[PDB]
Every structure is written in C-alpha cells, then in structure tokens.
From a paper:
Importin‐α is critical for successful nuclear import as it recognizes and binds to cargo proteins bearing a classical nuclear localization signal (NLS), which facilitates their transport from the cytoplasm into the nucleus. Importin‐α possesses an α‐solenoid tertiary structure characterized by a deep concave surface ideal for NLS‐cargo binding (Fournier et al. 2013). Notably, the twist causes the concave surface to become deeper at the N‐ and C‐termini, resulting in what is commonly known as the major (ARMs 2–4) and minor (ARMs 6–8) NLS‐binding grooves, respectively. In this study, we describe a combined computational and biophysical approach to design TAF8 NLS analogs, with zero net charge, and test their ability to target importin‐α.
To validate the computational modeling design, the analogs were co‐crystallized with importin‐α, and their structures were experimentally determined by X‐ray crystallography. The crystal structures of A1–A4 in complex with mImpα2 at resolutions ranging from 2.11 to 2.42 Å were determined. The electron densities of the 10 ARM domains of mImpα2 without the importin‐β‐binding (IBB)‐domain were clearly resolved including the P1–P6 and P′1–P′5 sites for the major and minor NLS‐binding grooves, respectively. The crystal structures had the same space groups as the original TAF8 NLS/importin‐α complex and every amino acid was resolved for all analogs bound at the major groove. Accordingly, the analogs bury an average surface area of 629.6 ± 21.2 Å2 in the major groove. Superpositioning the four analog structures at the major groove showed that the sequences also share almost identical binding modes, based on the alpha‐carbon's (Cα's) as the crystal structure of TAF8 NLS. The Cα backbone of the analogs exhibited RMSD values of 0.485, 0.529, 0.487, and 0.513 Å for A1, A2, A3, and A4, respectively, at the major groove. The analogs formed a total of 8–10 hydrogen bonds, 1 salt bridge, 37–40 VdW interactions, and 1–2 cation–π bonds. Visual inspection revealed that although the side chains for K299, K300, and K301 residues aligned at the P2, P3, and P4 sites, indicating that the analogs also relied on the consensus sequences for their binding, there were notable spatial orientational differences for some other residues and the amino acid contributions for A1–A4 changed significantly from the computational modeling. Crystal structures of these analogs complexed with mImpα2 confirmed their binding modes, albeit the novel interactions formed in the modeling procedure were disrupted by DTT used during crystallization.
Author numbering:
A (entry chain B): 1 to 6
B (entry chain C): 1 to 9
C (entry chain A): 72 to 496
Amino acid sequence: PEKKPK
Amino acid sequence: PEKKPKIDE
Amino acid sequence: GTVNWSVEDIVKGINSNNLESQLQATQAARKLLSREKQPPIDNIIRAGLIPKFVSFLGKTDCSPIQFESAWALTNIASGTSEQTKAVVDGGAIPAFISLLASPHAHISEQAVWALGNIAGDGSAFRDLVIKHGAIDPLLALLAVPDLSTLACGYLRNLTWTLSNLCRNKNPAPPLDAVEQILPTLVRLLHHNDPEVLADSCWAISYLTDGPNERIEMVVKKGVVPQLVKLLGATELPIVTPALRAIGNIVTGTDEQTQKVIDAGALAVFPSLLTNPKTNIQKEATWTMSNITAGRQDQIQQVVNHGLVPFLVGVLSKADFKTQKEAAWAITNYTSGGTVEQIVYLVHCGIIEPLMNLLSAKDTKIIQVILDAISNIFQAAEKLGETEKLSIMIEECGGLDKIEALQRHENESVYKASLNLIEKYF
C-alpha cells in the first residue's frame, strides 16, 4: 500500500 | 501553456 | 502608419536620433510581433533591437514607447527558451520590475505579462525573476480590499504570472517565496472569475507537486475545502487543476489524505469516475489509488461513499490508462484492506473485470493484477473460501489466462503466475 506521485 | 503572446489590446 | 513595416525600416527608425521616430518604429515592431502568422522574432533579435527596446522601458517621460517596447519584448519572451534568453540577456528583468510601479495600468500589466513569460521558461529564469525582487511589487498590485474593483484582464494576468512563479521543479520555487505568495493565492482561489480560479488552482497544483513538506505548506493554509468545492465546478478548466491539486495532496501522508476526505471530496468521485473527459477519469482514478493506499478507516470511507462499484466500473470499461490506474487502486485496496473490505470488493464484482485485463499487452498491469489476486486469495485463505474464489476465477475465464502467463517473458509474471496455479488451482 504505497503512494505513487505523478 | 507556460508562455503567452499578446495578439492585440 | 505602422502596419507591415520591414525590419530594415524598423531599424532605421529606432537608430534615428528622434524619440517620436523611435516610437513609431517600436510600434511597427510590436505590430510585426503581434501577427499570428510566424512573427519574425529571430529577425528582430538578429537586428540587435532588444537592447534598444529595453532602454525604452526606462523612458518615464515617454509612456507610449514604454508600452510599445514592453509589448514587443513580451512577444519575443513568449517564444523559445533561446528567444526568452535574449530578452533576459538584454537586462529586461529589472527594467520590467521597475515598470510594475508605473502609474499607467496598461504598462504595469504589460510588465506583469512579460515577467510571466520569463518566469514560465523554467526554474532558472523563475528564480532569477524572484532574486531581482519581482514578488513584492507583484503582490502590492493585489493589495486591495476587494479584488472585484480591479479590471478583469489585469487580475487574470497577475494571477497567471503568479502561477508561473509557483511552477516547475528541479528545483521547486524557494520556500520563502512560496510562503510570501501563498496568502494572495488563497485569496485568488476565492475570487469569482473562472480564469482566475483556474490559474489559482494550477498554482496550487504546482505547489503540491512535491514532498510532504511542500504539500503541508499548502494544506496548512486551509485551502482543501475550497479545492473540493472547485472540484465540483462546471468549468472543466477549473476542475482539471483542482483535481490535480487534490491528487497531489493525497500522495502525501495519511493525515494529509484525511483532510481531503474530511473536506467532502469523495462525494464528487461518482461524477469524476464517470466523467466524459478521459483525463478527468484517469486523474480521478489515480487519486482513488492513493486513497486506497491509505489506512483501513480511509478505505472504509471509500466503501461508505459507494465508490467500489465505480472502481469496478472503470476497471470494466475505460481508456486503458484509466484501467491501469484502477488496477493500481485495487492492488492498493487489497494490500491494505481488512478481510471484510476485500470480501465486499469481490461481492461488488471485481474478479471478472480484473481477469479480462490479464489479456493486456502491458507487463506492469499484469503484475499489478496478479498481486491483487494473491491478496484476495490471502483473504480467502483466512476464511477458508479459497475454492469458491478459484471457481469464480475459473468460471469467468481467468484460470485460462493465468496459465498462459506461466509462459510469459517477464520473470515476476510467470513466477507469480506459477505460484497461484500451484497453490490454489
């Protein structure tokens, strides 16, 4: 459950 | 998008 | 009088010893550079006119040549990086900052516009504009009791220029410049003009595109409720940047993500996740993915707002890039969710659309889906329902696809594929 920026 | 020319007043 | 002059003629006028002749030629140049078909920026630069235009910026006695030079240089600065560089190399930055104080609004505005083009080239010119002290004079132009008394075009230009000072990364703007600007931005984010709102949201989107500390600066000003309101606007030019800002914020901490939830954001996602603009759907699904990567109580709010069916929806049918974001949202949900929450997800119909996406020609989405299956199976292991899931997967055509994938180039694929077949099937 890891946040992935864009 | 980052820059804009002025075409008239 | 000043229409369709040659560059040769502009030069002859500008080199005359005659301020009025210089003014006519500068206007002629401005009109050249204002034409829609291929303005001759490079011929003007090659003629050596920029230093002259810049010196004309400083002629307080002759306001019209100030304006005409300002507009000419604005249009040069609107071109390539090299063209913008030529303006900067001519000394334009400090001369334009001096003009922010002009008593003539049209001149002040032109200077705002030019500095906006200069800062918009990139981090280095942005930071040079800041070092030359542009921010105080810019903010002073918005220091009025009510923004509504300013001319519409003027306020729109100021907002756009401020947004360019907030823009770009590697590096991001100086922290002290961001702190200086943010209070004026918060005020513009409450203005009623659609274009001011759009550019204000874009500025906030830039400021939230970075590490948690940058996000915190914004979140701390208490703008998230206003962003959520703007997320519900009719105008796509507002919604697009508002959603990007909200999406940026939820890439931060779980406590930053909670402020978006507390502000009421999830009630807009039924619309966003079915929005007819592909990009809104994509970015809304991406946003959902970073909310499902949160706490179990946060996942539970996704569930309570009725959004799992909408994720099933986008997984079933959407632009491929949106579907990949939805697969991520599911892997994240299954990775962090309680057993009850994962069960609910199956009950909403996740399995068939996940399995249909294993037919994709994208290695990453296959890995993501396979991870999600594994997590769901793990929740079934805890319930002793591994068989019912196996049958479900089998009945919708899933087992066929997983088998094939045991014979896929990528290693982690065939590996994860093999493990599933051998453990459950």
